Point group: D3
Chain length 22, copies 6
């Protein structure tokens, strides 16, 4: 639900920024 979406979004977003900078 909303919790899983918000939590998963933040984790993914941080990992994605890391990939963009690699």
């Amino acid at each position: 639900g909303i919790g899983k979406f918000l939590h998963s979004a933040k984790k993914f977003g941080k990992a994605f920024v890391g990939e963009i900078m690699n």
Copy 2:
């Protein structure tokens, strides 16, 4: 790293599809 990115992407993607259908 790559593992965290791939894993987090799949979790987020599934949650996002769930949100779009809600």
Copy 3:
């Protein structure tokens, strides 16, 4: 904040699915 994020995510997600199918 959280409201804008959730709302914008749903709008984007729906538009993105539309683009993928075009």
Copy 4:
């Protein structure tokens, strides 16, 4: 269409960066 996709993407992207930094 393309307009909605581009507009919604920018709004979402800005909100997502905000969430990542929160």
Copy 5:
């Protein structure tokens, strides 16, 4: 620019759906 964004989005979106279903 806009072309690269639109093109890259579609490619990514299709690949992402593929990952979600794997």
Copy 6:
């Protein structure tokens, strides 16, 4: 597969940051 996903993600992510800053 995984290669296409990772490559397409990085390209999209960079283009998306560019759009957010435009």
